[PDB]
């Protein structure tokens, strides 16, 4: 009974979080009303990881929905699986955060944060043995970014020895709402460097390119982007949701994936990514080749520009475990220059028999690569292009922030980039 408490904050956080629960509920046989209708015992074996069991054999997601405006959470409550969530676990305000990190972190967010912690505390108190937390949010907005990292800080204060995990959506000019997103993301990244154990970097720049170039979607929508995020979140949590030996829990994953405390930002990847030739059987060699392909990466960084510190791979579906080991060893032995040679046997592989919906077999990639510095460099350059002219700062100083806090965040992220660079050489 290793329970995880899930939190989703802001527009992005709640829309991706909704799709995540929709996907895994289907995989575990839970219908929109919380009733189980599966046909395999593997579905319920580890169900309590993400679901509470209520009267009448009902399974209720251990999820807390947070926002500073009601709109998105109204949509969730009226969505496909909206009725499966605990009505008490909707915590929202009315003011909004105005795409402003300061509003989420210091003013509007500060007024609502205690009521969220009350719900978090309620869910944790009923856990047999709480593993830790997972937060879904964007870094480019105000609520998920500012209030999300505020929540992480207050959760760590109350649960200092629990694991904090996040799925963090990084902003990109190609899929942007406002010009201040580099500000909100730089402020948030520093919080994550200090207060999270594992962060899955989900780059909207990569999600767009995959949709446009690989899936041939002429005009990608946020819904198209979130289909990739749902599939990825399901893949990376498979080790937690089904019987297995590798990782299997948040702390063990962290111990195998994070050799240095600040370098806990992961490049996720998924295969196949097929456009509508969609019925063709996919071989283990193809699954393995694509899973390591940069075009299958959702961080928008080229792995061949850095080195892998650690890699976790998860194969799903009925396949040849012997062939899985062969192709994996083939990739490592054929490109051993992109794997640091001072962490022996740093590529681990796991297999799960239950494939995702509508696929015979798939592969999910989790990489701790020094190439992720390209992502932080990109944000840092966009931050500096505006900050050198103090552009748009009045939105933040109007909420009580000083310019010095921006300079410190700017320096903290450039420090992070420098740390990745030393282990790359």
């Amino acid at each position: 009974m290793r329970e995880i408490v899930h939190i989703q904050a802001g527009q992005c956080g709640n829309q991706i979080g909704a799709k995540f629960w929709e996907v895994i509920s289907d995989e575990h046989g839970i219908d929109p009303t919380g009733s189980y209708h599966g046909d395999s015992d593997l579905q319920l074996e580890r169900i309590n990881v993400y679901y509470n069991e209520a009267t009448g054999n009902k399974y209720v997601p251990r999820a807390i929905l947070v926002d500073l405006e009601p709109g998105t959470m109204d949509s969730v409550r009226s969505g496909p699986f909206g009725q499966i969530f605990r009505p008490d676990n909707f915590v929202f305000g009315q003011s909004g955060a105005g795409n402003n990190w300061a509003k989420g972190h210091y003013t509007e967010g500060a007024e609502l944060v205690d009521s969220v912690l009350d719900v978090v505390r309620k869910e944790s108190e009923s856990c047999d043995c709480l593993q830790g937390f997972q937060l879904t949010h964007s870094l480019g907005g105000g609520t998920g970014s500012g209030m999300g990292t505020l929540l992480i800080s207050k959760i760590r204060e109350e649960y200092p020895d629990r694991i904090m995990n996040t799925f963090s959506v990084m902003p990109s000019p190609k899929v942007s709402d406002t010009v201040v997103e580099p500000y909100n993301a730089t402020l948030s990244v520093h919080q994550l460097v200090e207060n999270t154990d594992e962060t899955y970097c989900i780059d909207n720049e990569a999600l767009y390119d995959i949709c446009f170039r690989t899936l041939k979607l002429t005009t990608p929508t946020y819904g198209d982007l979130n289909h990739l995020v749902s599939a990825t979140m399901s893949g990376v949590t498979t080790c937690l949701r089904f019987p297995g030996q590798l990782n299997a829990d948040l702390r063990k994953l962290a111990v195998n994936m994070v050799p240095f405390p600040r370098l806990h930002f992961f490049m996720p990847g998924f295969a196949p990514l097929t456009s509508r030739q969609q019925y063709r059987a996919l071989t283990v060699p193809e699954l393995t080749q694509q899973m390591f392909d940069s075009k299958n990466m959702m961080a928008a960084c080229d792995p061949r520009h850095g080195r892998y510190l650690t890699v976790a791979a998860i194969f799903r579906g009925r396949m040849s475990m012997k062939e899985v080991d062969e192709q994996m060893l083939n990739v490592q032995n054929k490109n051993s220059s992109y794997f640091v040679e001072w962490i022996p046997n740093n590529v681990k592989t796991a297999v799960c028999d239950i494939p995702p919906r509508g696929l015979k077999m798939s592969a999910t990639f989790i990489g701790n690569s020094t190439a992720i510095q390209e992502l932080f460099k990109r944000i840092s350059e966009q931050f500096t292009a505006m900050f050198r002219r103090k552009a748009f700062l009045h939105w933040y100083t109007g909420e009580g922030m000083d310019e010095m806090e921006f300079t410190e965040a700017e320096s903290n992220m450039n420090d992070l980039v420098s740390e990745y660079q030393q282990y790359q050489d």
């Binding site: 030996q245 063990k252 962290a254 111990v255 195998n256 001072w342 022996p344 046997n345």
Partner: protein, 438 residues
């Protein structure tokens, strides 16, 4: 009759323990409910098998064993498994969250809070013993519990049972079946702190068991069940002298006397033959000379290394089945004229031989075929130092960068314990080279 208490620590120790006690029951004719028809002394007795099994008034034969794990899922299988009725709940100890593959978490953070409970349960078994010999401790090197909690337990056992022998069965890490990158750290940390507390340690390299299962059992991708059923066969051969009538290795003290002339060099190499697939149409039964000759092939060793390039300090041959001394001696004569067997000058060149007429038992439906004779050779070779070098080398690669060290310091371990443990291993490798190389 002197009792032996088995202690199984962590997933590897528990699952191997389940395979062993399953085999012990089959070898002694004990049913899953603990009943033993052939035992005419109901609720008592001092037979050889009583070294490993106590008896209740109702005739239940209870393993003298404790299972310990910091998470419940592995031991939960035992509680609801085929042999659930063998143990009473006090013998199966589980915590709620494991050591996360972190030696420091198993030894310090969690070990400090459960050690007293584990010692109390062990004391309850000791109170049933009229003449306790000591302990057999099963554990992995790589796990946070198997490494960290075992070393703490061994330290306390030396305090609470100063005059008792302690033997180890230790699983050396192999990447083919491992998924924890820090296992070299945990292996060296637990070896450093356990070295002075263990009288004799039988290391089994998962890489060796894995390849034997693929090569000899035609298993494309062996599971822990496949690995453990083979390991239990080797463990059974080693402990058979304690559980059946005989005169060789009849008590734990004799393992040290016969296999370990130098206390720190207490890691005998185990070699086992024959391993034959049950799915085979029908195999030819190997002779005494053939299975004896097989003991000097690297392919059947529990740790892959080359004994041709080391020195022997002791060598025991443990036969099971249709074997007579005449054939053993004739086989030994032939192997000396062909094999490169070099003993150290301060040890006699010879072999201690034990023969148990009962052939090996195979679990029904298992992978191993029934054979008429088998042998396990226990040899103390400097060649096993190859395993220490490999492990220390991986340790050095990661530690030079301090990779993952913060996980250990965060549990309250000092960084100096790493270098202390590593320096002890360097002195161990130097001990082997002084004994083995000219």
């Amino acid at each position: 009759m002197r009792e032996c208490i088995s202690i199984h620590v962590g997933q590897a120790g528990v699952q191997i323990g389940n395979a062993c006690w399953e085999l012990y029951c089959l070898e002694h004719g004990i049913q899953p409910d603990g009943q033993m028809p052939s035992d005419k002394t109901i609720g008592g007795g001092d037979d050889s098998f009583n070294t490993f099994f106590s008896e209740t008034g109702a005739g239940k034969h209870v393993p003298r064993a404790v299972f310990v794990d910091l998470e419940p899922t592995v031991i939960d299988e035992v509680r609801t498994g085929t042999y659930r009725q063998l143990f009473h709940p006090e013998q199966l100890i589980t915590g709620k969250e494991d050591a996360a593959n972190n030696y420091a978490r198993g030894h310090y953070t969690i070990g400090k809070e459960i050690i007293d409970l584990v010692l109390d349960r062990i004391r309850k078994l000791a109170d049933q013993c009229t003449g306790l010999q000591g302990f057999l401790v099963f554990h992995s090197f790589g796990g946070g519990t198997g490494s960290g909690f075992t070393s703490l337990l061994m330290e306390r056992l030396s305090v609470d049972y100063g005059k008792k022998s302690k033997l180890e069965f230790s699983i050396y890490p192999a990447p083919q079946v491992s998924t924890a990158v820090v296992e070299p750290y945990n292996s060296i940390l637990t070896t450093h702190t356990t070295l002075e507390h263990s009288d004799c340690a039988f290391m089994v390299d998962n890489e060796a068991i894995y390849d034997i299962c693929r090569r000899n059992l035609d298993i494309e991708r062996p599971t822990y069940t496949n690995l453990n059923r083979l390991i239990s066969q080797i463990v059974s051969s080693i402990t058979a002298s304690l559980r059946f009538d005989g005169a060789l290795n009849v008590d734990l003290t004799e393992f040290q006397t016969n296999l370990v002339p130098y206390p720190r060099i207490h890691f005998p190499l185990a070699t086992y033959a024959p391993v034959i697939s049950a799915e085979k149409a029908y195999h030819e039964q190997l002779s005494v000379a053939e299975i004896t000759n097989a003991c000097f092939e690297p392919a059947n060793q529990m740790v892959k290394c080359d004994p041709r390039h080391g020195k022997y300090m002791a060598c025991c041959l443990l036969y099971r089945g249709d074997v007579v001394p005449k054939d053993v001696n004739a086989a030994i004569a032939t192997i000396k004229t062909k094999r490169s067997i070099q003993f150290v000058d301060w040890c006699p060149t010879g072999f201690k031989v034990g023969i148990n007429y009962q052939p090996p038992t195979v679990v029904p439906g298992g992978d191993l075929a029934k054979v008429q004779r088998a042998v396990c050779m226990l040899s103390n070779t400097t060649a096993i130092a190859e395993a220490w070098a490999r492990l220390d080398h991986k340790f050095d690669l990661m530690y030079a960068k301090r990779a993952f060290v913060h996980w250990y310091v965060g549990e309250g371990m000092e960084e100096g314990e790493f270098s202390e443990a590593r320096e002890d291993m360097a002195a161990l490798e130097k001990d082997y080279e002084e004994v083995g190389v000219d």
